[PDB]
A paper describes a structure:
To elucidate the structural basis of the interaction, we determined the crystal structure of Rac1 in complex with POSH at 1.25 Å resolution using a fusion construct linking the C-terminus of Rac1 to the N-terminus of POSH. MRE1 adopts an extended conformation followed by a short β-strand and an α-helix, while MRE2 forms a β-hairpin structure, in agreement with our 13C′ CEST data. Additionally, MRE2 partially covers the Switch II region, which serves as the primary binding site for guanine nucleotide exchange factors and is a key determinant of the catalytic activity of Rac1. Notably, MRE2 also partially overlaps with MRE1, forming a backbone-backbone hydrogen bond between S355 (MRE2) and S334 (MRE1), as well as a side-chain interaction between S355 and S333 via an intercalated water molecule. MRE1 is connected to MRE2 via a flexible loop (residues 346–352) that is not well-defined in the electron density map. MRE2 adopts a β-hairpin conformation, with its interaction stabilized by hydrophobic contacts with Rac1, mediated by the side chains of V357, I359, L364, V366 of POSH.
One of these effectors is Plenty Of SH3s (POSH), a scaffold protein that mediates c-Jun N-terminal kinase (JNK) activation in apoptosis. Rac1 recognizes Cdc42/Rac1-interactive binding (CRIB) motifs within its effectors through a hydrophobic surface that emerges upon switch I loop closure, ensuring that only the active, GTP-bound form can engage effectors with high affinity. The Rac1-binding region of POSH has been mapped to the disordered region between its second and third SH3 domains (residues 260–445). To delineate the interaction site of Rac1, we measured 15N R1ρ relaxation rates of POSH in the absence and presence of a 45% molar ratio of Rac1 and determined the chemical shift differences between the free and bound state of POSH using 15N chemical exchange saturation transfer (CEST) experiments.
Author numbering: 1 to 177, 319 to 345, 353 to 369
Amino acid sequence: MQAIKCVVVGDGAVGKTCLLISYTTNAFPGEYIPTVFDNYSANVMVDGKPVNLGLWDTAGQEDYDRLRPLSYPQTDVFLICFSLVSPASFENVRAKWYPEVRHHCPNTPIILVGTKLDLRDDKDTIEKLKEKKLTPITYPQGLAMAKEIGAVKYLECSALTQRGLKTVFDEAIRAVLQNRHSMEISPPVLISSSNPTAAARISEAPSQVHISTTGLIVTPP
Ligand SMILES: Nc1nc2c(ncn2[C@@H]2O[C@H](COP(=O)(O)OP(=O)(O)NP(=O)(O)O)[C@@H](O)[C@H]2O)c(=O)[nH]1
Ligand SMILES: [Mg+2]
């Protein structure tokens, strides 16, 4: 089975973990728990042929800067995420995440993902940004940032509503499997995860992330 490794990076609180849990299990977690590393191993069918996705979640906090690149070797595609309602997270795409990824991985494709699409029209969110002379990030603004960092695609989504969500992962797959026509991609079947919320939905005992000689590995429950 062809395997694809995808690593998700971006500022704290932009919605990386919810993106992964929502896509892989159609659930949306109930308490914000900061990530260290987590793995999701999910299968899809691309034009009727199985492909394994190895999805890696990372910590957005700067305290994990030294450790985070442990996840990077052998990555096939990065998702750099920012919240559509956090201008700071948007600027950090350029200031922090693009350089960090590119310095480690000069040739790996990047998809730029704007998250929390469901908040872009939220009155309270808009007003709070306006108090600070700011606005939610617009689609053209995200597109421009994607061009500045040489991302292969710019995509917007909500983990909460799932608008745009399948497309993020399908386009990540398409960006990797450049020889495939990839006309149709099935929803994912989660096989294993180290995230307790996601692992519980395979049932409905998480795997464990460990350091190994070869980088990060997963040990079964
Ligand atoms: N409305 C809305 N809230 C979202 C969405 N995605 C995430 N959130 C919320 O945003 C907060 C952070 O989400 P989370 O996925 O934990 O973010 P993270 O990027 O993994 N943070 P870290 O680097 O610290 O692990 C949570 O309160 C979560 O419910 C979304 O699509 N819409
Ligand atoms: Mg997280």
